[PDB]
Amino acid sequence: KHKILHRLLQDS
Amino acid sequence: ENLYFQGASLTEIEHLVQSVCKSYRETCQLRLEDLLRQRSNIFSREEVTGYQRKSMWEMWERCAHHLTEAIQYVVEFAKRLSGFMELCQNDQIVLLKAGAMEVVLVRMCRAYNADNRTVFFEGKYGGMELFRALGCSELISSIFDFSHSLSALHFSEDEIALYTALVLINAHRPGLQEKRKVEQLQYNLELAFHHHLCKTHRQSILAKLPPKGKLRSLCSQHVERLQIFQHLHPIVVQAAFPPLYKELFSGG
Ligand SMILES: CCS(=O)(=O)c1ccc(CC(=O)Nc2cc(-c3cc(C#N)ccc3OC)cs2)cc1
Numbered sequence: 001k002h003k004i005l006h007r008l009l010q011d012s
Numbered sequence: 013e014n015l016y017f018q019g020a021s022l023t024e025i026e027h028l029v030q031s032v033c034k035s036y037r038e039t040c041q042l043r044l045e046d047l048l049r050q051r052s053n054i055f056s057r058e059e060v061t062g063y064q065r066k067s068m069w070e071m072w073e074r075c076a077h078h079l080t081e082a083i084q085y086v087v088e089f090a091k092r093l094s095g096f097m098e099l100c101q102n103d104q105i106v107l108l109k110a111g112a113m114e115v116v117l118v119r120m121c122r123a124y125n126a127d128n129r130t131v132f133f134e135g136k137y138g139g140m141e142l143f144r145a146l147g148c149s150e151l152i153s154s155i156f157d158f159s160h161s162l163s164a165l166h167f168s169e170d171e172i173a174l175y176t177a178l179v180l181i182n183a184h185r186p187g188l189q190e191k192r193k194v195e196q197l198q199y200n201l202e203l204a205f206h207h208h209l210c211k212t213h214r215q216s217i218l219a220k221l222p223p224k225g226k227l228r229s230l231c232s233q234h235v236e237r238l239q240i241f242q243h244l245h246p247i248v249v250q251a252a253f254p255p256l257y258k259e260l261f262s263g264g
């Protein structure tokens with residue numbers, strides 16, 4: 001699912 | 013995609029040293045000067061007793077939250093690290109899932125006072141007895157021992173920056189799709205770290221660094237202890253543990 005890591009990596 | 017995915021010249025290695033040290037300075041969570049200044053601020057016997065009287069689950073939740081906050085700074089460090097954002101998302105996640113806790117454990121030696129065997133936790137310094145309610149004494153003692161051993165090396169902030177960049181960019185992590193790209197980035201980061209040690213007359217620490225399986229053992233013990241806790245308090249984990257912590261240590 002990797003819900004949080006994907007979001008942190010995509011947030012600029 | 014990135015200069016550091018190919019062979020780098022000496023000038024490019026010098027730039028990499030500066031870049032890594034800058035990325036670390038901007039993401040280091042707490043300032044070293046603040047941690048050193050706070051060494052005299054120690055939990056009293058009454059405060060220690062208060063932590064010891066906390067329930068196992070309340071203490072696990074507090075520690076999971078503190079660990080998650082530290083991990084968030086490691087994610088930012090990774091994003092600012094030369095070449096990391098040029099890797100594919102699968103590999104960025106593989107590297108962070110395996111390495112984020114390892115980076116935290118290394119960073120933690122800055123918050124550990126080897127003079128009195130105390131660690132900075134929730135505003136003050138306290139000994140390993142502060143964590144007695146967790147019921148994972150072996151893991152806590154192993155983490156204190158690791159911080160003690162790293163503290164004996166007298167790392168500078170720049171050494172921690174370069175060493176933690178290497179802990180994270182590990183081409184041997186299971187699951188990497190673009191293994192060769194990671195191998196090259198790792199080689200250049202190894203050169204940057206060793207160049208800095210050479211330039212500062214600190215090559216003597218190379219033989220004194222922890223063996224690679226040491227960090228792996230600590231991380232494996234953490235995941236095992238979490239599984240034991242989860243069996244005891246499954247709804248605490250489901251309802252009150254940080255989502256990022258669950259994503260990293262209990263498969264979501
Ligand atoms: C890491 C980046 S930092 O800027 O150096 C920084 C930022 C914030 C803090 C406070 C904090 O969260 N302390 C904590 C300590 C522990 C802990 C430490 C040992 C040890 N030896 C053992 C068990 C432990 O828990 C069971 C968990 S949480 C410290 C440092």
Ligand code: NA
Nearest residue numbers: 121122124163
């Ligand atoms: Na220290």
